[PDB]
Design a protein around this ligand. Structure first.
Ligand SMILES: OCc1c[nH]c2ncccc12
Length: 297
């Protein structure tokens, strides 16, 4: 992990933008890839914390320019970009701030029932449109192969868990990667452009109008299975949960909800392995062990 001071952020922007003057800056938020800074109250700059984040910033920037003005909800416009530096593909990026507040589960369920059905229509229409974006022009770079991803993870996990479990416990992991690979329900879909982190914190809301007013955070945007954008909403408590997602699925006119449920089920179990992989990637030894712990069951 790398760090920035406010002055490092200022002078990093002024190098590439010698006329742009910063009057106010504060930290808007921080996630696993970038720290967000709010500058002159109308712009959000992400600065990457590591080479992986930088590449997700590169891809976000690429995807937003490319889908500019084609979706039925507002999204960030890229107004500033940095450049490669050492082991970062994109040193930073600055987007217009979309106004509003996260559409939390609490905020959503505190809403009159008609505003809830509204919001669920606005989400299906957004996804209906995001998922019918023609992808012929995207580099195959950006097309997530789920087969390869699984085999990539499997080898990393085989390497990692050889130091952490014996024969019997390891068989359970062996069995789980074999079952997934040999079930075509995970690989036989119609790829499209997906947001790929579509959850309550990236759905902005306007309490004065009481309607969704923005989608943010496309850093994970890629070509892939569109069901992923429903699965990321379904977790109860942490997310909207089944009933609300089901309304979205029906405004979208999904013809196979049971298969959405079956990919949520698989993605729920799989989460243990991501925590192990990313836990030992960054240095997050509190999730390496929480991943490790669930797996011994
Ligand atoms: O993901 C960064 C970002 C770009 N535009 C935004 N608008 C509001 C809140 C966050 C953002």
């Amino acid at each position: 992990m790398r760090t920035y001071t406010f002055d490092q952020v200022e002078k990093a922007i002024e190098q590439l933008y010698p006329d742009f003057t910063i009057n106010t800056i504060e930290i808007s938020g921080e996630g696993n890839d970038c720290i967000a800074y709010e500058i002159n109250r109308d712009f959000i700059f992400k600065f990457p914390k590591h080479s992986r984040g930088s590449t997700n910033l590169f891809n976000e920037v690429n995807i937003l320019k490319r889908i500019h003005n084609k979706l039925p909800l507002p999204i960030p416009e890229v107004v500033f970009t940095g450049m490669p530096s050492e082991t970062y593909q994109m040193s930073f990026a600055g987007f217009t701030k979309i106004k509003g507040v996260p559409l939390t589960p609490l905020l959503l369920n505190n809403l009159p029932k008609q505003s809830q059905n509204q919001a669920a229509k606005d989400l299906a229409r957004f996804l209906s449109e995001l998922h019918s974006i023609n992808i012929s022009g995207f580099k195959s770079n950006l097309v997530l192969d789920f087969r390869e991803k699984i085999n990539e993870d499997n080898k990393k996990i085989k390497k990692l868990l050889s130091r952490e479990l014996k024969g019997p416990q390891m068989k359970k992991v062996d069995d789980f990667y074999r079952d997934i690979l040999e079930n075509e329900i995970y690989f036989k879909y119609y790829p499209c452009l997906i947001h790929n982190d579509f959850s309550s914190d990236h759905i902005l809301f306007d309490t004065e109008k009481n309607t969704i007013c923005g989608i943010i955070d496309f850093g994970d945007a890629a070509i892939s299975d569109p069901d992923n954008d429903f699965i990321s909403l379904m977790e109860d408590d942490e997310e909207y949960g089944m009933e609300f997602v089901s309304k979205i699925l029906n405004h979208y006119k999904h013809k196979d909800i049971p298969t959405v449920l079956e990919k949520y089920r698989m993605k729920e179990k799989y989460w243990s392995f991501e925590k192990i992989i990313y836990g030992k990637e960054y240095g997050y030894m509190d999730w390496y062990e929480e991943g490790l712990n669930e797996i011994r069951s």
